[PDB]
Write a protein that binds this ligand. Structure first.
Ligand SMILES: Cc1ccccc1CC(N)=O
Lengths: 300, 237
């Protein structure tokens, strides 16, 4: 079990850690989060009391280093930093724990939610989508645009998701126009899976990372990406059976965890209706179809 | 953007453009089978691809063999249309390719877009106009060449005959749309009006009668009257 200590909490802020969240008062004695499960990526995120705009946060993996948070009064945000000195770090944390100034990662034992939402998400793939190689952790916020969005302005601050475009030469073989447009299997299996992602695990990892950025930061380009990666599978007549079963599980837990009051903006009517009811895979997502029907029957 | 009453004059500028209508590509008669079920029998169709500035009509005849052994023919017809329009553009010299293709039915947008991916600087546009191009098969010479075809065939017609020697494109397109609107709402009456007079003939290579300017005014009035009457009847107004 690892720890992310905080130097201080000088401004009032709502702090999230994965699907959990805590309110912290201005200058409240607060020195971090302990008992963070090892073996998964994590995200620690922030919404200031005075600016409900710009949710922002950091993706990290405690196996990759010792990380802490410190507020920067010049840039006006809580920053993640790495501590290279293992002994300095252990000592800071030990003191803070002894003073019982840390919240505990509040994992129920029965609960697999975070595992299920991050099953295929790997820190090294996050770092290729979010390019800032001097740091071992990745910053994401509400405003960051995707590469694809940028094509239709700052490259250094972009989300480099894999570009999917159903009306593109990459998607459509010359001479197979109608075939490839109505059955995207050659785009899914040959172009994306075999060519770009290499395997379905990396595909699922990017799909899951896009969803989480959409949910935790309201990142609109991430939501576009999540839905595109779902629609590419559902619009393919030929999908490995293991992928379909795993997709049903992935989407079930995403739909389960989504805030009920965000389903209006985070769920695209056309994609979900086409996927659950018209597509080749309308009959391959039983768990996802059942939780969508019993929770968001309005959207459908 | 979509073409409508507001940007109508754009049809007659010097940017090359083509209308494409697919309403007569897949044509069937519906009949009963021996067992009393219903079946379709296809007949020859055509793509109606028209330059509204010049009157060029590239009439691609769609022979019933193109449907043999195919499923979901109404869907396939849209993709066949787009395949043939793309092949027409490719055949055309670069300076003769359109800058826009306006489709008369929005369901042609995605098929044409996908077939035209190699032409990213050709704009594919829908329209809010209810153009009467479906009535093209009420033009006798056009109907005759479609039904007689024994194989796929492209036939080249001036749909304005030589009207452009005396009138502008705008006026020619208005006359064409009026004649076609008339043939669509009451084909029998429309055709009676055009051929009532034995002394007015159709040149061997033209589609419409050789009316003088004054006879065109009478004809156009007769066609307007036909259209308003039918409209009253349609709505009891
Ligand atoms: C179709 C046609 C009609 C009248 C004149 C010239 C043509 C040939 C062309 N547009 O390539």
């Amino acid at each position: 079990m690892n720890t992310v200590p905080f130097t201080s909490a000088p401004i009032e802020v709502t702090i999230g850690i994965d699907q959990y969240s805590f309110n912290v008062k201005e200058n409240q004695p607060f020195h971090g989060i302990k008992d963070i499960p090892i073996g998964h990526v994590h995200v620690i995120h922030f919404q200031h009391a005075d600016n409900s705009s710009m949710r922002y946060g950091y993706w990290f993996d405690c196996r990759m280093g010792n990380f802490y948070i410190q507020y920067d009064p010049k840039d006006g945000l809580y920053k993640m930093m790495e501590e290279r000195d293992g002994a300095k770090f252990e000592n800071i944390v030990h003191n803070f724990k002894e003073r019982q100034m840390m919240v505990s990662y509040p994992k129920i034992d029965e609960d697999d939610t975070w595992y299920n939402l991050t099953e295929f998400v790997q820190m090294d793939k996050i770092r290729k989508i979010v390019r800032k190689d001097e740091n071992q952790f990745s910053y994401v916020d509400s405003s960051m645009t995707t590469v694809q969005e940028n094509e239709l302005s700052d490259p250094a601050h972009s989300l480099n998701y894999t570009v999917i475009n159903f009306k593109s030469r990459e998607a459509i073989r010359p001479g197979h126009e109608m075939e490839d447009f109505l059955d995207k299997s050659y785009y899914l299996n040959t172009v994306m899976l075999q060519g770009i992602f290499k395997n379905s695990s990396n595909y699922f990892g990017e799909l899951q990372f896009a969803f989480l950025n959409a949910m935790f930061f309201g990142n609109y380009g991430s939501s576009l990406q999540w839905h595109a990666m779902i629609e590419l599978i559902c619009s393919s007549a030929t999908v490995p059976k293991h992928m379909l079963d795993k997709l049903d599980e992935i989407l079930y837990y995403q739909i389960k965890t989504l805030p009920e009051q965000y389903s209006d903006i985070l769920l695209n009517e056309r994609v979900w209706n086409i996927c659950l009811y018209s597509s080749f895979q309308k009959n391959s997502l039983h768990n996802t179809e059942k939780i969508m029907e019993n929770k968001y029957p309005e959207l459908l | 953007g979509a073409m409508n009453s507001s940007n109508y004059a754009e049809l007659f500028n010097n940017d090359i453009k083509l209308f494409v209508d697919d309403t007569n590509v897949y044509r069937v008669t519906v009949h009963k089978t021996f067992e009393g079920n219903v079946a379709t029998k296809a007949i020859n169709g055509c793509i109606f691809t028209l330059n509204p500035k010049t009157g060029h009509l590239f009439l691609k005849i769609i022979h019933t063999s193109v449907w043999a052994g195919q499923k979901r023919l109404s869907q396939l017809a849209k993709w066949k249309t787009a395949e043939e329009v793309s092949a027409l553009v490719r055949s055309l010299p670069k300076e003769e390719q359109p800058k826009q293709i306006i489709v008369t039915r929005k369901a042609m947008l995605d098929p044409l877009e996908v077939h035209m991916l190699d032409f990213p600087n050709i704009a594919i546009r829908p329209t809010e106009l209810r153009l009467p191009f479906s009535a093209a098969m009420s033009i006798d010479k056009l109907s005759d060449v479609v039904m007689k075809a024994t194989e796929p065939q492209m036939v080249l017609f001036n749909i304005y005959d030589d009207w452009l020697d005396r009138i502008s494109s705008y006026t020619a397109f208005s006359r064409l749309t009026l004649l076609l609107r008339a043939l669509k709402t009451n084909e029998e009456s429309a055709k009676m009006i055009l051929l009532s007079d034995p002394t007015i003939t159709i040149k061997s290579y033209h589609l419409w009668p050789s009316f003088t300017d004054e006879q065109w005014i009478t004809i156009e009035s007769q066609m307007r009257d036909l259209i308003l009457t039918e409209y009253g009847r349609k709505y009891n107004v």
